[PDB]
């Protein structure tokens, strides 16, 4: 005997996804809360945390949006100029 599964898909290194988070710029203050967050991930909270702090050094203390993209165990940091309805990957 046999039966279908029709289960959902799974993550993949090929495709790429971006994650947005709202927080204060250059926010060193912390009690090792990112430890358990990136614990299972692999990377380190210090390296990643310092990356954002340094980048947001020119505008430390101001509220800004940062886009973090994870690809091939790699993280990217970039500061957006403004926030607006940005939805539409397809052409035009």
UniProtKB/Swiss-Prot annotation:
Disulfide bonds: none annotated. It is found in: Cytoplasm. The modification Phosphoserine is found at residue 44. There is a cross-link at residue 46 (Glycyl lysine isopeptide (Lys-Gly) (interchain with G-Cter in SUMO2)). There is a cross-link at residue 54 (Glycyl lysine isopeptide (Lys-Gly) (interchain with G-Cter in ubiquitin)). Belongs to the universal ribosomal protein uL11 family. Component of the large ribosomal subunit. The ribosome is a large ribonucleoprotein complex responsible for the synthesis of proteins in the cell. Binds directly to 26S ribosomal RNA. This is Large ribosomal subunit protein uL11. It comes from Mus musculus (Mouse). The lineage of its organism: Eukaryota, Metazoa, Chordata, Craniata, Vertebrata. The gene is Rpl12. The chain holds residues 1 to 79 of 165 of the full protein.
